[PDB]
Amino acid sequence: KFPKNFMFGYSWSGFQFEMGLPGSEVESDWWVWVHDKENIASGLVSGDLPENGPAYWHLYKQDHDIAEKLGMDCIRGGIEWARIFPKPTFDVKVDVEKDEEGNIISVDVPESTIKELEKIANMEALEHYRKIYSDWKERGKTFILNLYHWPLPLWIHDPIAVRKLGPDAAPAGWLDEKTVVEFVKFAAFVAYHLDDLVDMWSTMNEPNVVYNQGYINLASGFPPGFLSFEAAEKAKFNLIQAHIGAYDAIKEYSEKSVGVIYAFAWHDPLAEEYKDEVEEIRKKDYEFVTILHSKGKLDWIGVNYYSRLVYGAKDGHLVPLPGYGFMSERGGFAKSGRPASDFGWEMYPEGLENLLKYLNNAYELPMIITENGMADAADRYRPHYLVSHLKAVYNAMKEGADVRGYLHWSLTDNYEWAQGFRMRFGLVYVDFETKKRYLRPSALVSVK
Numbered sequence: 001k002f003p004k005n006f007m008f009g010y011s012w013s014g015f016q017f018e019m020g021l022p023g024s025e026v027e028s029d030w031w032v033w034v035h036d037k038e039n040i041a042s043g044l045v046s047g048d049l050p051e052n053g054p055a056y057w058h059l060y061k062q063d064h065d066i067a068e069k070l071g072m073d074c075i076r077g078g079i080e081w082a083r084i085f086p087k088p089t090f091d092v093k094v095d096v097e098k099d100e101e102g103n104i105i106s107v108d109v110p111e112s113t114i115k116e117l118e119k120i121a122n123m124e125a126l127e128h129y130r131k132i133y134s135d136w137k138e139r140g141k142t143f144i145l146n147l148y149h150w151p152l153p154l155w156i157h158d159p160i161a162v163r164k165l166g167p168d169a170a171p172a173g174w175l176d177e178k179t180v181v182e183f184v185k186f187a188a189f190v191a192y193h194l195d196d197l198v199d200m201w202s203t204m205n206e207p208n209v210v211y212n213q214g215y216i217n218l219a220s221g222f223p224p225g226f227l228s229f230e231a232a233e234k235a236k237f238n239l240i241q242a243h244i245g246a247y248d249a250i251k252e253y254s255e256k257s258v259g260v261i262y263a264f265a266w267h268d269p270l271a272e273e274y275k276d277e278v279e280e281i282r283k284k285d286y287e288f289v290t291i292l293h294s295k296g297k298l299d300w301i302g303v304n305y306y307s308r309l310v311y312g313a314k315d316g317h318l319v320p321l322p323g324y325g326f327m328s329e330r331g332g333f334a335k336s337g338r339p340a341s342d343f344g345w346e347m348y349p350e351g352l353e354n355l356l357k358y359l360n361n362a363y364e365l366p367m368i369i370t371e372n373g374m375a376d377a378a379d380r381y382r383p384h385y386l387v388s389h390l391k392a393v394y395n396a397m398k399e400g401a402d403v404r405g406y407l408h409w410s411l412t413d414n415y416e417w418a419q420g421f422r423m424r425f426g427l428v429y430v431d432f433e434t435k436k437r438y439l440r441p442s443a444l445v446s447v448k
Contacts, residue, residue: 002394007142007405008446009074010067010427011371012056013149013205014083016414020055020435028082028151029159029173033223034418036160044221046420053415054430060132062437066428067411068139070446075136076144076202076261076302076370076407079194081153081186083125085117088155089182092116096181104241107181109188109249117189126193133197143197144370146261146302147187147246148204150417156182159223167231173224174211174235180242187246191253200256202302202370203246204239206263208288211235221418240291247297261302261370262289264359266351270312270321277318278311282358293363300404301359302370305352305389307345342375343416343423349388356396356403366402369393373409375416375423382427382442408446412437 015031018024025031031050033039040047056063067075094113097105137143157173167175187203213222215232243260250258267285269278283290292298310324320327323335330344338347352372359367372389376382390406397403413430416423421432427443430436 002397005404007074007368007407009072009076009142009405009407010411011076011146011407011409012078012411012414013146014078014080015050015149015151016416017054017056017077017412018080018083019050019057019415020053020432021058022051024055024057025051026080026083027086027154028080029154029157029223030151030417032154033159039221044225045418046422048415048420048422050415052421052432054412054432055435056412057128057132059435061135063411063428064136064139066437066439068141070427070443071448072141072411072446074142074144074405074407076146076368077133078146078149078205079129079190080151081148081156081183082151084121084189085153085186086122087120088153089117089120089185090178092120092185094181094185102177104180104245107184107245107249109185109252111192113185114189114192117185121189130194130197133194137197142199144200144202144368145190145194145198146202146205147190148183148207148242150205150210152179157224159225162224163226167224173214174238174242175231177238177241180238180245183242184245184249188249188253191250195254195256198254198256200300201250201254201258202261203243203250203258205261205302206304207236207239207243207260208285209263211239236288240288243292244295244297257299257366259298259300259302260289260292261304262286263304264355265326266305266308266348266355268308268310268325268351270310274311274313274318281311286359286362289363293365298363298365300366300368301363303352303356303359303367304371304409305355305369306372306374307341308348308351339381341381342377343419345374347374347381347385347388349385349392351392352389353392353395356393356401357399360396360401364402366404368404369406371407371409373425373427375425377422377424379440379442382440383445386442386445 095108158170161170213220308325309320312321325346328334328340328346334346412428413424413426
């Protein structure tokens with residue numbers, strides 16, 4: 001048994017879910033990126049398109065109904081910046097204070113600025129977000145809103161251009177210090193308008209995945225797809241600012257818990273001799289969260305756990321080894337003998353149990369499993385994945401970890417970014433031609 005107040009649910013993100021029937025469609029850096037001819041042709045993206053997705057924007061009522069009757073009481077979803085401000089906000093001026101080193105101290109966004117923003121915002125789309133959030137909230141359920149889930153406005157980031165001409169030649173995204181301010185406006189705008197429907201906030205989702213995959217692991221098919229550690233560091237730095245600033249903006253219009261949602265790989269030493277060196281890596285990997293903790297800008301943490309990384313020696317440097325964790329064979333078995341998801345991600349509930357105790361000891365904050373699931377078209381392993389991983393959470397809690405819920409990823413199949421639709425994470429299958437929902441048997445583990 002889990003505590004009386006422990007929430008069960010799921011999570012969705014705008015890009016992967018909203019689009020699917022005409023009307024839905026929204027220009028963003030990511031959109032352009034998955035439509036780019038060069039990218040599709042070179043195999044760097046699936047060539048699947050998000051406008052062929054599950055169409056949640058229209059079909060949210062059914063999905064909610066399904067989740068409800070599956071006993072779910074909490075959803076964590078998003079709102080898409082590029083959907084709310086298709087047109088730039090730069091001309092709506094705000095007073096911004098900076099120190100010597102070039103840090104952000106404040107960004108005043110009064111009620112009047114919100115009104116000036118209403119003029120150029122898509123209030124049509126905002127109203128639709130209300131309908132969607134209300135549909136769930138008025139059922140007497142909990143909702144968590146996450147402000148950023150990767151796509152940016154085209155007027156913020158043009159990844160094609162950035163890649164061909166370099167960041168000085170186009171809207172550079174999280175490389176332009178300007179982008180942080182505009183995001184802050186966005187945060188305040190959203191707080192002001194939607195707080196009545198939100199129980200808890202998250203400034204952003206997996207920002208570590210964004211800066212690392214976009215500017216270092218080119219193989220990932222993330223934008224803008226060019227190699228530079230300096231770029232990565234800079235993007236990381238501005239994402240930290242964006243969080244801090246958005247935290248202050250939400251607080252100025254809401255009295256609720258604000259946190260962040262983060263990609264927590266569990267790191268494991270192949271051999272006992274590396275144990276120390278691997279803990280050093282844990283620190284570096286989670287540093288993003290460590291930082292925000294130390295500035296007092298985290299009321300809670302969104303844990304997103306899937307698999308692990310195993311480190312060993314190669315030609316003298318210590319690196320993450322193939323055949324383990326996220327680097328296992330797709331639809332096969334890791335070296336450990338654990339099976340892997342269709343994404344080639346090892347099944348490793350142990351990691352989550354270890355992780356939660358690590359994060360509780362390190363931060364002593366309230367946590368929610370804001371993402372946990374697997375790509376399994378066949379529902380071959382999902383049922384065990386679920387039950388094993390819930391057991392892992394339950395164990396961590398017994399040893400003192402403060403965990404207030406679990407949100408699976410996800411209710412329905414959706415658009416797994418550069419991998420298209422071949423990665424299906426849903427407890428509910430979706431026929432992307434008919435947009436029809438059919439539950440996988442694993443969905444009934446949840447009816448409990």
